[PDB]
Amino acid sequence: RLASRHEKSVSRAYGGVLSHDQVRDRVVRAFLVEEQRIVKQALKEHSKMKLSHKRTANKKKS
Amino acid sequence: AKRTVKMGVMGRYGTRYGANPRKRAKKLEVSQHAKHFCSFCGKFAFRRKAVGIWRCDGCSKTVAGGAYTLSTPNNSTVRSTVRRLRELAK
Amino acid sequence: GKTVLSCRKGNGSVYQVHGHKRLGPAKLRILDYAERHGYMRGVVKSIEHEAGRGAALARVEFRHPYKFRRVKELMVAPEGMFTGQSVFCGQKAPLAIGNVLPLGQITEGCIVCNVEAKPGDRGTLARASGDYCIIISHNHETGRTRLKLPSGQKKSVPSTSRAMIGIISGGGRIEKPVLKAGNSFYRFRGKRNCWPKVRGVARNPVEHPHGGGNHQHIGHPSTVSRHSPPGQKVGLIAARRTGRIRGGKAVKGA
Amino acid sequence: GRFKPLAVKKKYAKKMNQNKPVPYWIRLRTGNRIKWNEKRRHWRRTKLNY
RNA sequence: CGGGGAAACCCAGGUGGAGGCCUGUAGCGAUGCUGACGUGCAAAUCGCUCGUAUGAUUUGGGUAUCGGAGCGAAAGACUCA
RNA sequence: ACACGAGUUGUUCGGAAACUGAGCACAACGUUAUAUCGUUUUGUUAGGAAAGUGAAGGUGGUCGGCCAUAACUGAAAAGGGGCAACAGAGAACCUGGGAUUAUAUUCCAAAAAGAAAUUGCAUGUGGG
RNA sequence: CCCAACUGCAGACCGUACUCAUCACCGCAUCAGGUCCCCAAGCAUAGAAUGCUCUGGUACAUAGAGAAAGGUACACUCAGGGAAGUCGGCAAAAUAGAUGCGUAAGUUCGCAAGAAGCAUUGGCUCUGAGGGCAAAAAUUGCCAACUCAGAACUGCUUACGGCGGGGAAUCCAACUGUAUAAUUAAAACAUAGGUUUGUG
RNA sequence: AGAAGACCCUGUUGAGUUUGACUCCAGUCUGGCUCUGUGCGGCGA
RNA sequence: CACCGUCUAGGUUUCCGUGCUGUAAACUGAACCAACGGGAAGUUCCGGAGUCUUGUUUCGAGACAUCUGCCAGAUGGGGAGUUUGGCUG
RNA sequence: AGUGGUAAUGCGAAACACUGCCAGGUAACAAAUCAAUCCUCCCACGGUGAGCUUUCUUUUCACCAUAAUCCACCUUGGGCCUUUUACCGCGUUGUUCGGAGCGGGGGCUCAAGAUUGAAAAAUGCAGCUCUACGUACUGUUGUGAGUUCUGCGCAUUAACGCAAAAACCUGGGGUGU
Ligand SMILES: NC[C@@H]1O[C@H](O[C@H]2[C@@H](O)[C@H](O[C@@H]3[C@@H](O)[C@H](N)C[C@H](N)[C@H]3O[C@H]3O[C@H](CO)[C@@H](O)[C@H](O)[C@H]3N)O[C@@H]2CO)[C@H](N)[C@@H](O)[C@@H]1O
Ligand SMILES: NC[C@@H]1O[C@H](O[C@H]2[C@@H](O)[C@H](O[C@@H]3[C@@H](O)[C@H](N)C[C@H](N)[C@H]3O[C@H]3O[C@H](CO)[C@@H](O)[C@H](O)[C@H]3N)O[C@@H]2CO)[C@H](N)[C@@H](O)[C@@H]1O
Ligand SMILES: NC[C@@H]1O[C@H](O[C@H]2[C@@H](O)[C@H](O[C@@H]3[C@@H](O)[C@H](N)C[C@H](N)[C@H]3O[C@H]3O[C@H](CO)[C@@H](O)[C@H](O)[C@H]3N)O[C@@H]2CO)[C@H](N)[C@@H](O)[C@@H]1O
Ligand SMILES: [Mg+2]
Ligand SMILES: [Mg+2]
Ligand SMILES: [Mg+2]
Ligand SMILES: [Mg+2]
């Protein structure tokens, strides 16, 4: 209680809570798991618009 | 040298408890203190902590299951059944 | 002339459970809106032993549905449950080991555990170590699922009652002999006061109906009626048949 | 020992101030009745147990 | 670590420190002398001998269960001589 | 033993203030001809409106758009009180003394024999 | 208004003596009974065994004088015989540490087992091994702390304390454990193991 | 000496325990009405 | 007996759907105290965040008993009270 | 509106200032083996006093002390980083470890100590010397044995898996903007 904050923490994120091998394993999965959904979200909107000209292009075919 | 003939870990108990109840306990006292295969981490390192609790000494993975052996033979029958039944829905 | 020991355990004084080192009650998470319509995902953080069970527990971490917090949930684990697993929980959850989904959604012939006998009571059937229920059929007119309990006794339950998928963890336990009265001391240490077990014939006639005599014999026939009073109902209570069961294996129960 | 409540210490303090003899001039009054104290408590013979 | 073998596996020297293991203090009990004492040191004690002594072990404080009731590894034992 | 006279000194030591445990049972509710009865920690009372605390802002005397001090409005905190451990938790003081007939990690006074640690509140100096 | 280092002032309540036991508590009492915790020296020795000793404590438990018979002992011996004593080897005797060798039937192969049974042991003077850290370093320097084996020489009156007697079978209970405080500790009870019943 | 025989018997004296003794009582079960309402019917008299 | 009115809207899907933005073996991240927009920088009022209540907290059972109270009968050493003649070499 | 180092992570006179809400950690528990701290015992060095002396004994006995609290920072056990990549190697009395990164080379840290200092000689003890609880001076090793403090735990036999909470600590997010 009487000590400075520096004997109980360290200068980076989650310092004094998490270690160096798992601060980085959260930085890496905060990037790779967010970006994996962006690949699957933009794949989903690209599929529904290809449906929007697979059948709306059949208005000029019968 | 070789220290006993056929009482292995059960030589702990001496001339007690009957020959065959030492032998039913022998296959499961050997099994729970043997290190099993960490399929997560590739190593032979699963040691049982408490009853039903296993822990890869290389991978620090804690797996529930099996009182004296890591995977009981009724589990692998179940894992195949769940894997088959999720293929019929996809 | 004095009160029988089996009648005395219902006062529950020296004979209550030994629960100080127990964790909380193991149950499924609350059947909220988030499972009646979607799935909640959790994550297994620890596999736990409490005193007086042979099955492993698990703390699964959900997010609270309505508040900025996370809910620690103590479930009893199936076999193969590892820390990190991402349990899914609800209607739209897939069919995998560890997931908890309604019995209407689990296709037939599937091994389930922590099945609940009415919707919402958070798991009452198949929770001892190594046990499981098998789903036999579904009825869509009545909306009920009929499954085989671990005794073999069938039971029809509503198809909105959910169940976890798997064997209960910690199985194979009874197959090792105890070998010692010391090892039975510590087995019943975290349970309750019910050991050592003194036979009724070893007692005096004041304590038990079987006690007394010059030879240790039960005098009267030891199969008592269903309608015997407390104190008189000791022995083989309402035995339909006795003796060494020579033949098949009848399911026991009403 | 060392622990006592103060309400037990103040009862043990009253009995020390009662454990004193009859003075001599009591024995010289007119309608005298008292020779000795009849309530002289000794710590070994009879116990207060406070 | 050494040795034998085509292999299955056997054979030896250490290492290690398992056990309701053994001898044996303290502790906890109480076998025999049918010892001493038996208006005692004592309304149950003394002496030597004996049981056990890592365990179903011993123990303090705190708590909870009682009168036709309590508690009991069960002797109708124990519940302030 | 008896009579008489004395003797126990604390910011830090033990307790309480101020922890929780096995448990207890006040309120509430139910019961009972009768409360002297039951429930009352598996997260936790009571058919069960037991929070009197207050984020942010508005109102108008203070310190260089931040504070801080005074009175209206209202986000957010489900789950009433109190006990139970002088061996568990917690806990800021250590020596020296020629200082007693008897107390001391308790008394020692300007060279405190002295050396500290800690809590509350306050000035001044200095910094934003 | 925030903060630092300092300073200035104040730091409340209760306990505190003595005991904790062969005299301070409980057993009617200054009762050989019981009663939780901490500190814990030297030598012999495996040693919280047991014997003796510096520190601390004590000489307090009615004493004196003193060869009866009879007793009681945490006291001894006893020639020849050696359980003939006796319900019964009850009581005593005997065995004994350590080291080397050796060990049967039976067996759940773990044991039985310290089976049984043999041998050695002193004192003294030496000789071998078993190491460190300081500069073919495969060797020159210096040095602690002990243990074991061997060897001559010499002595025994077998000489502290402490410390299994052993074997062949029969009965019963598997085992360690519990158990009639104050006449029964057992073969009883418990136990693991086996079975049954009720129960979704 | 110890102590109104702990054996035995007597008493219209007990008490612990037992049970197809005698008289009952809780408990368990079973029937009746009740709590107990709303519809479409069916077997009945 | 007809009609009207209460009675409105909607993720996804090529009318269906039935309240929906995430997963379809699983491998330990994050998520709060509203951004933004409209209609009349600060207010007020809306949307974001659908509206509606012949009302039940929600699910299951349901006039059963898994409820309540009285009668009625079987059982009933679990327990209570009491008794267990007399004469008598 | 904190800031260094590739990184393990560093830097505190007063802004590296504050905490509706959230999440962690501390409190917080565990064998045996080996190594073992304070301290005790012994041995070795000596100094002071005392005891023995027909003989012997470079001799026997006593004493030789350093409290908290600071301050500055050589070992031997943990964790890790970076660089070389290694599939036999490192290591323990001991049941094992390594491409999921061994071993070397450089490091960063943590824990237990050691050391220099402030306290502290002014104190303590035993001697002794001088004209009254008086004074002036003199003195202040150990590869021995025992030590649970520690190393020490996701830590014991286990169908035994080993309390809780207050109080506190750090972060996330926000404010400062
Ligand atoms: N991979 C290295 C190998 O080591 C080998 O060395 C091994 C052999 O020389 C030798 O093997 C022996 C052998 O004598 C003989 N022919 C057969 C015997 N089984 C082996 O014995 C070996 O295995 C037994 C287990 O049974 C162990 O007890 C023991 O440790 C070991 N000696 O002992 C060594 C193992 O420790 C050879 N050098 C060669 O094959 C090769 O270099
Ligand atoms: N149930 C009524 C009670 O019967 C008791 O007396 C009864 C008992 O003495 C005795 O009951 C016995 C019972 O002891 C014994 N252990 C079992 C036997 N089944 C019973 O028997 C009685 O009950 C069954 C019906 O269940 C009848 O078949 C039978 O006729 C009848 N004697 O038979 C008597 C007739 O019932 C008591 N007199 C009294 O408590 C009360 O009347
Ligand atoms: N009201 C008296 C109380 O009833 C309770 O005891 C009752 C229960 O033990 C027991 O209840 C049983 C129940 O266990 C069982 N599962 C279902 C059965 N319906 C009930 O039975 C009871 O309840 C119903 C209620 O209407 C009555 O119809 C029936 O007559 C009655 N015997 O019957 C007993 C008599 O009612 C309490 N245990 C006790 O404190 C007390 O005697
Ligand atoms: Mg023994
Ligand atoms: Mg009897
Ligand atoms: Mg006096
Ligand atoms: Mg005494």
Ligand SMILES: [Mg+2]
């Ligand atoms: Mg002879």
Ligand SMILES: [Mg+2]
């Ligand atoms: Mg009767």
Ligand SMILES: [Mg+2]
């Ligand atoms: Mg240790």
